[PDB]
């Protein structure tokens with residue numbers, strides 16, 4: 629199983645930083661959206677559903693540093709409160725075609741709300757396949773804004 633970020637080189641496990649551009653001004657009660665489906669893609673390394681990969685997001689994925697913030701996480705058509713207090717539903721990947729991860733993060737903050745370059749969220753993703761032991765792998769996506777976000 630492989631992933632990549634903005635068409636970079638392939639990733640088998642571990643922590644990767646994911647840089648997003650955000651709206652530089654937000655208002656109280658307004659909701660900030662981070663669409664990760666534009667950035668991260670994954671695929672089956674053999675194709676044909678021969679050794680199918682099963683991926684989900686993991687309990688304990690949270691805001692970093694922004695722990696008082698409210699949020700939601702959209703994953704594979706379902707909305708979960710964020711931070712994740714349970715694992716998400718499983719996405720099956722069997723083709724050698726990069727599939728955008730169907731993942732969005734909704735943030736309600738509660739001056740500068742997000743600093744450029746600071747980790748905003750740490751999202752734990754788990755993979756296991758079908759044959760042998762399934763060769764389980766853990767990925768952490770460190771979500772980071774290219775610009776500060778301010779609220780009047």
Ligand SMILES: CC(=O)N[C@@H]1[C@@H](O[C@@H]2O[C@H](CO)[C@H](O)[C@H](O)[C@H]2O)[C@@H](O)[C@@H](CO)O[C@@H]1O
Pocket residue numbers: 629630671672673674675679680681756757758762763
């Ligand atoms: C047996 C092995 O290590 N194979 C490598 C591939 O990994 C596997 O891929 C399948 C389908 O994605 C499944 O996830 C297995 O659990 C996993 O072992 C893959 O890493 C490729 C990359 O070119 O190299 C070997 O084929």
